[PDB]
Amino acid sequence: SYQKLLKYYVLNALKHRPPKAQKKRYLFRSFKATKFFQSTKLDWVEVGLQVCRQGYNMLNLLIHRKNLNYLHLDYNFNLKPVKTLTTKERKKSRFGNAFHLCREVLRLTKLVVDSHVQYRLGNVDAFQLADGLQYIFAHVGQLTGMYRYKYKLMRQIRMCKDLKHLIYYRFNTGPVGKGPGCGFWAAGWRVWLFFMRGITPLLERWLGNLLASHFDLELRAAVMHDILDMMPEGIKQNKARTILQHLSEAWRCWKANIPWKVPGLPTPIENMILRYVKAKADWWTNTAHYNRERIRRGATVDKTVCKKNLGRLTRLYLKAEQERQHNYLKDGPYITAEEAVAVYTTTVHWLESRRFSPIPFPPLSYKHDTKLLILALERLKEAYSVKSRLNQSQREELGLIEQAYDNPHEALSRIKRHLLTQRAFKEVGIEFMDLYSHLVPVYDVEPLEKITDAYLDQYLWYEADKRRLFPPWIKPADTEPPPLLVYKWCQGINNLQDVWETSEGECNVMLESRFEKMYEKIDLTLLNRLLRLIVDHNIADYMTAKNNVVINYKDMNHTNSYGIIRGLQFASFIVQYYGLVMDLLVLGLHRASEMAGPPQMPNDFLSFQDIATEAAHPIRLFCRYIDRIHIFFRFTADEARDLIQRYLTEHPDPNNENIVGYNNKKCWPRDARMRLMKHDVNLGRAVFWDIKNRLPRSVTTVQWENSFVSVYSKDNPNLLFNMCGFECRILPKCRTSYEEFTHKDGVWNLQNEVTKERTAQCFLRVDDESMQRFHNRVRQILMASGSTTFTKIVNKWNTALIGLMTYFREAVVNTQELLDLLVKCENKIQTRIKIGLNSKMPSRFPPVVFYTPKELGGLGMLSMGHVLIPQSDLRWSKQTDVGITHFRSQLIPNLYRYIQPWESEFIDSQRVWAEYALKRQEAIAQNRRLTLEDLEDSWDRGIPRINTLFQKDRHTLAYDKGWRVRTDFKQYQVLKQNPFWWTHQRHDGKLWNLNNYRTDMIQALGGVEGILEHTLFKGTYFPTWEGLFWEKNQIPNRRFTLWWSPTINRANVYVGFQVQLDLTGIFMHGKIPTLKISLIQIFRAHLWQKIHESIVMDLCQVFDQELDALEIETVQKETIHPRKSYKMNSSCADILLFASYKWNVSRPSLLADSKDVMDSTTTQKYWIDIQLRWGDYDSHDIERYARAKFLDYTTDNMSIYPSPTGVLIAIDLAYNLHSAYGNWFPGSKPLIQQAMAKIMKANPALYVLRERIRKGLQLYS
């Protein structure tokens, strides 16, 4: 309190400014000169009463000015309605907050006045008066509801609370202990006077005024007024219907990038049109960039805004592309002749050094044309297997594909004829995939050309894999997932000759970079000249002339002459071979010849012949993913010094300015990231400059601002690289602390191949770009409409969570910000469903609603978080012929514990493939074929899976080479997003198991009988669950709400507010229209009263027969009031029995209780009441309900019963329970037990209720 009061004092001291000069201000002097005011001298208490009664009269006049007869203002200013309001009466009772603020201020004022009126009547002493004024200014917020009306008033309360604290303890030392009274009200008085100083003119202004796309449209209106008002009347009557027609046409021609030109137009009005188009174009461009920068930062917006903004930036990028293609066609080729001849002869020397044989044309029958054509058609129908409803242009495509299936040889003849003859092609459409961060194109190709291009894609990759065209450092490969690429890269870093020995000044350099504008800077003529060396010239002309085609977007057509078309089938070859030409420019021919080795004995990826040719050059590790290069250097002292000297020769640095601008990893701490010593920074600048000098800028360009250099030396303890979405920090064992060996996840222990001891540690993290892409996917899931069912949203969430975790398996546990983001997005997804249930926010909501599987009627949600199942939610019940039995059965298991790590899976894969090799070697020599008996011990173990060995399509899938880069490039061809782009199930198998998750989910939620208590199953009269089925992926929202109604409509979910339905006794907590629409349909046509009267008539027919066995002389059915069936405050007797002579009665006991001792209080009249119940999950125990209703209705002066001896029978319809409590005469209890059993088994009204429940839930058996 001291620190906060000192905070307010420092703020008032800092925000102080001198007041502005003005005329001196006298309100009462101007009031005095008016003849309507008089002056007198009065006591303070009398004028204090006059002010508050005048304020009461003012508020009364303001209430009855609007003819509001139903609102009563108390004399302590409490405003209350006299009755229950209606819709229009709530509309006519909408005052401003200034009204209720003035109400509470006058309430405070009347408290302050009446505190002294209590004093001057002789009731209290002034010692008791000063305490009372002290309580008021301290507890304004507790005595008044003024805090709800102004929120900034919360500043004024706590300050007056803090001044409440200090004085008290400064008062409470010495002989003073505790108790009421200080009497120092001035400190609380000044603050509320200073508050009234600011609140006064706002309330005066309110009483004063009580008692007494558009900007562009206005700009266009001003421009049209400036045009039309200058022209005279005979031209005003003509150009009002002349300009407006072509005024939109000029804007449309600008939007379609059409040059606007019309004859017969004067030049100043043409310049005015050009100024109009230019101003609207600047407004539209700034609006489009502003709307993109709003939604980039995560601000929510309507979906139509995103749909329009995508088209706006699509048109702007089309105008930019038509500009840059015209710039290429005007400026000529950007490449010189000498660079082209240099890279041409470089490719010639590399193909002569490897003795490569060129890929020929398939002459008549390659005897594998059918397999490649079937694989191409399966890749074309791979995208169309998602949905079963397609458009007409796609139905034509599937018809052409099925005609290619039915007649394959004619299709092959058409493909070969289009290869040998066709050079002109149809126009390719363009669309954009709406990622929130990065715009990405998707191309649309004619299907007859697409079949030919897909067969060309298959044939070219199948020939390129056979002829060994690509060296193994070109990545990705078919056999390696990218985390296995990261692991093999770390093992290649570890297994070098003395890579961590830096005792003599050695250095490690880890460069990572991206070829900037790799796809857009490929000259097609240069592509053809480099392509004619490896394939047929007709095939090269087919691949070259395909890129020179017109791209269309709906109004805009432009030819392509610079850059390749990335959406083609065979374009995945064009990416990979040309980058090998980059391998000849960065790595050099000698080092690439050392890495690739002899053609007669090629080396492995990150392997060499010997150690001498491995360490004879500093350039000793190299890798390239599709556009990102990753290079690793080992330097000595003298080579690094000479390289720094060669850098500082042309580029000196007198002020050491190369430190500012160095890219560094901010996700790691400062002791973890790169330390920027001057030698290491100069060495990194020298390395990047030496790599940049080897590439001609007209061919390709690397940039420092998108690159990264990590230097390991004596002054840097650790090495860093970003690769394949992974942040990796390598740290030596010998440069750190002792043996300790604490096991953590996200840590790869690195060991040597030869010595097999631990040498270094690799630390894994998820980079920022993957987390931002995941948050983009979460925001795309949060763009679901209100009519969308919950199960589709949960399925999209589960798809995104599997696509995150099954790629980032080990690295999620290491990073904590992603673990927080997952939980935050999970709570947002759950809140999206909780708002869709009811608009009011519930206090609690069970997780068992979400995480119930779809087979049991739930959503089937996956879990990444710490969710606890509380007690008294795992208890269930059952009813049988001896009575009611209760039973009692924790955390929800998560996803990351049910997925294998990477390193143990790699070790297991190596072991099972070595064992498979040894068993295959023993099987060949013994003339034995391997079966499932020899491979049942290593089932679903290994990358790739062993399941691919026993597939029917071995000879078909064995001919599919180069599938991973095509699977990655599927995103440029299909408009949907592609999770699992890095894998394919037919080749690598299934890499996870999710049935244990469902098993532990069913086990952890208390079992099936524990789950089905929430699900309204016992109202459906199915004895088992296993014989049932759902009516058919998704569940509707009404059926979901009606299914989970026992656990939603509870007292502890929507606290306080409860209502009762009219014709039933159903209590609704809060209000849910989606459940009310089902409760009206099920309980229609007075079904509650029909069930009640049916049970009454059936029990009266029970008491009608067997008359002499109970000594009954008269059974009587009482005149039941039609509102008795649902009124629950009081009740009445339903069936009355008259004893013949006399009956003995017992003490009130339960229906299942057999310990009956009867008393001597013999009565003649006996009464039976029937009560129905609609319960929920926390309150459905019918025995204590019957006991509580009997003890309520027999011990009050509101219910009427003719006899003090009777029984109350309670039936729960939500779970179909029945019990009884009360007095019993001899022979009545087993009779009524068997009678209620026969009623609950054979009441036709209950059968109508249960069949309406089964019709509403759509659940059959």
């Binding site: 939980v823 514990r897 997925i899 198991n993 244990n996």
Partner: peptide, 28 residues
């Protein structure tokens, strides 16, 4: 326990990643 999914930061001490993960038997 008002819903409120909690963060997994610091709430794993004895729980590994490979634990409670099972594989399937070969079908038929």
């Amino acid at each position: 326990p008002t819903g409120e999914v909690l963060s997994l930061v610091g709430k794993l001490e004895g729980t590994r990643m490979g634990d409670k993960a099972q594989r399937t038997k070969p079908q038929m």
